[PDB]
RNA sequence: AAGGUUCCUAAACAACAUUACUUGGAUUAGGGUGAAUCGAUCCUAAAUUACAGAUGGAAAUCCUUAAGAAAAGGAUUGAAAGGGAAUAAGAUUAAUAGUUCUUAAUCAAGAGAAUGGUAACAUAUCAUGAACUUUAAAAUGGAGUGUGAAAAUCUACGGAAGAGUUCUCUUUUCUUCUUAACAAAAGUAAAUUCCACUGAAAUGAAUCAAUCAGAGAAGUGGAAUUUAUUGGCUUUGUAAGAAAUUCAAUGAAUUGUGGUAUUUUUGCAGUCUUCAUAAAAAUUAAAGGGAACUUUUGCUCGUACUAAUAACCGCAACAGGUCUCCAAGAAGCAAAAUCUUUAGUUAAAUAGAAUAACGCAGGUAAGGGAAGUCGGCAACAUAGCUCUGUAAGUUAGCAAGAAAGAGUAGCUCUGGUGAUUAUCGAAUCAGAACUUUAAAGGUUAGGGGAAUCCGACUGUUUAAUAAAAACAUAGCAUUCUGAUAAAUCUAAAAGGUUCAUUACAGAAUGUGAUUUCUGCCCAGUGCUCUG
RNA sequence: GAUUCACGCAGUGUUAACGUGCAAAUUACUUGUCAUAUUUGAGUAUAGGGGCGAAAGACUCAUCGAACUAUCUAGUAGCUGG
């Protein structure tokens, strides 16, 4: 598992067609957009809720998006 | 105080069967096979270890980047910098000496 | 301690099953079978063991392709 | 263990081991110099003493002349006054 | 043992297959005196030595 | 700490007076640093039976089994030196 | 009767040499033109310790003159040889320490170690630690030279035999008294199996011919003929003189 | 390793477990062993065996790279403890799981003629590199000291949840508060080796110890490597969604920070010791030289169970024997004896009653104290630690824990031994009052002395009546041998051992440390001779 | 190749226990020893007038002053029993 560090690559990565599925976990303070690519699992830890919303609109409709909470699916 | 068991069929504390005990979720303690300790490279004239090349397994050098297993210099990777500074002076001072001798 | 005490370390097998005779008579260290004379080409037969001949010789098995020829 | 801190039980009839076993003689001297040689370097780095004086004190400590830290700062204090005469 | 060769495991497998008693219907034949297996053994009585 | 049995005091009292005195001469030489012919330092330290390794400047000099140069091995150096020079000129 | 310990030592069951950590065969280099009629140059890469002998072995690294590549060798170290040395091994070589020379060029009285016994067998005579053979004379009529072996016997050799100049290193080894049994037991780490030696007279009559009766003694003269059968050949064989020399 | 179905479940109890059994490792019938990542498979070690050749009446023996038109240089086998490409956490089953399921990775084989730094050296594959050659890794003894790191135990501050005691008290006692493989670089260490500036004497630098310097110390600034995967520790993705502890009847709560403490593990640094110098190849990387992101596959074999006071070997559920890994508290110098926590068991050739003799095992005793007896056999007695003191003899090292004498408890105090600029932390030593049943002794725990004989010492031996005064041993000494030899195996042999050797060596012997001394005898029997 | 404690190992004494035993050589206490001439596992080597032996005629599958198994062999017996 790898971690992306800022908005530049995460937005670029989602637009690419290699993405298999996307998971978002909503913790008490932050949120991780654990996108799952062909090989690794990249996650961006966002603390600003406004910056997560623009990330929540960038996912293409052709992949499965699962929103997790304090209860596992 | 948790007592562990070897996870492989090896039951003897040989050099190849070294293990490390680590903690695990819930207080369980598990067993991991830690690798051996190896020597680095040595200069071909003085027998001293060379700098810039890690001390890893012979096959693990293949996975390293092409600049992570050499040193960028003449005879870089097989002779120390002192081992090479003397090579140049020998190859040059000798040529000047027998240039005028004959 | 030549009796019961010293009989505790007997777990290193010497004779394993042979391939041409099927008895447990293949000496691992000598690399030859003590009952049917392995890699030696000839079957090991001795005249003093007249019983060891009638235990395994011609006629004691199935005779898969010889019971036919003699009948003909 | 709380009572043993005040020395309630550390008598003579409650010891079954040799004096060197309970208090090793090597580790009471390994620590003794590390206490002293740190002070000598501390003063030399600070500038209280010089290299020539700190050299005659490095060997004097090494020869077991000063029993504790207090008995070394007194000798440095003494040998500094003879310097200005 | 834990580590047995292939030609050795299949011979053990036959020695547990042969360690079975007479089938019930066989003993009910006519003139059938084969009531019990006398070639049987057990792990704690006789070591098969193989 | 000991009047006369210096290095062979580790043998205690159990080899004889003469042998412990004889071995005293050899164990002393075997464990001493000699003056190194090349680097010119008291750094030559034995490594094996007849291999003296100059720790100062990293050279391996061969020599006697317990001394850097045996007495009979120094005359031969002079004997050959005397025979070489005379042979050259007449 | 039985077969005494000298009769079981010839079969080689447990009496084989323990030569497993030994470096290799220490000898000169093969004879060739560049050594018969010229000189080569060898570099003493490093001095090593071949287990089971008191003379260090030096790892000389020549150059292949006929082909491309190194020609690594293994020379017994003469005393005084050091790492990084240049030793020349040829017929025209200079008479220094370690330079291999044909025995027919050394001046009379020259010290030569590791002398061949026949031209081309690469070292026979004077190989042990601290030993050397001294040239005596020359004879140009039949190209033979006399030398004095370390045993004192004088032998006549062809003048083409090679012989490294000097004495062998590791001299004066035996002057140290082995003090214990353990030190003498570790000395045979890389040799045969002969250390704890049980006396013949402390043996039953079958094992050794000296097996005594109700008193521990020999009973018959120990000086025997050379033509005794193996097994009865004990004691001193063909003794010209016995007893302490006065 | 050995055993082989003993493993799990159901029915059942004629036999077997020195009574009985509803129990069983026993009867019958079903079920169970999942691998690209663990091993075998691959490579070599001590060693082993083939074609041709040599030897041999014969069986067959010898050579293993030498004899060969054989194999670029030499054939086959040889290790489940040596070398080795790559995997972890949670969960599941009546049993299998580094093997299955979820999640997350890794390896191999494919498929789609460059810059920077003064220098040490450095750049998410990059930045060409054939023949031939070399270097290095794989790859290596042991002892003792110091230290970095992790885990366990102990402990400091602040807590969250539950459990135990409570008529006598206790802000009390206990449990839980965790995290992998593989990767990232907020912050930050110890050690070692190098580079650049300057050139040390009034010599310095430093360690517990050492050790180092004008072929260059100390100082300042840098570089590289090791430290259980990347980069050692904290931290981060994995990852809380798992797990542990609680509450409610599937749904809810929490998971800070330290330590100048003890042990274990794993590395690093130098020091010491050898008449000991403490493996090979597969396989991999670099150099010298200049010729010209995705996707596919990963085959075969083992995997159940015991590993023992009931699964192995001893005729058996035999007090015998059998190689290893993990390791809590009290107490002490101690992995000692004794007691307890997690875990296992209360059954392991049957019990009840009475409390005779003679017994096996364990004890005690008045007065005397070896008078018993072959003989202090057996038993009793001294025993830890601190201080004082310690003879003759002696190889000057030892004798020596010689012998002998004093102290030791409990409670309340005081002082000494350090880090940072008053706080904080360690068990250790010393001293003073007061009290008592006057104190190592529950357990562990030397009897001492004066002489004589033998063996020099540590060591080894008659498995099953002899453990020594015997054997060995270092020391002394004797004999032969120049290597095509000496010894010496084979019926024979370009055959074999010492010999991968070479007189400071090989072979054959007697005496048995050190000190002192080895006397006279060559007639006899051996050996030898240049007669 | 110092003195000792411990895990282990041995077998000095009781000539203790047992002696139709737990045991075809074991048990308990006492004693010694407890890393360098140390203990031990696996593989490999040495085989009967042979091997191996720090030497006791000891060890060589409960067998050794010449192993076990089979052939000569129903060996011979002036000797004992029927």
From Swiss-Prot, chain G:
Recorded GO MF terms: RNA binding; structural constituent of ribosome
Keywords assigned by UniProt, alphabetized: Cytoplasm, Ribonucleoprotein, Ribosomal protein
One of the record's GO cellular component terms: cytosolic large ribosomal subunit
Gene3D superfamilies: 2.30.30.30, Nucleic acid-binding proteins (2.40.50.140), Ribosomal protein L2, domain 3 (4.10.950.10)
Entry keyword ATP-binding: no
Protein's GO biological process: cytoplasmic translation
Region of interest: Disordered: 206-246
Position of the signal peptide: none
Cellular location(s): Cytoplasm
InterPro entries, per the entry: NA-bd_OB-fold, Rib_uL2_dom2, Ribosomal_uL2, Ribosomal_uL2_arc_euk, Ribosomal_uL2_C, Ribosomal_uL2_CS, Ribosomal_uL2_dom3, Ribosomal_uL2_RNA-bd_dom
Family that this chain belongs to: Belongs to the universal ribosomal protein uL2 family.
SUBUNIT field: Component of the large ribosomal subunit.
Job description of the protein: Component of the large ribosomal subunit. The ribosome is a large ribonucleoprotein complex responsible for the synthesis of proteins in the cell.
Name recorded for this polypeptide: Large ribosomal subunit protein uL2
Organism: Entamoeba histolytica (strain ATCC 30459 / HM-1:IMSS / ABRM)
Gene name of this polypeptide: RPL8
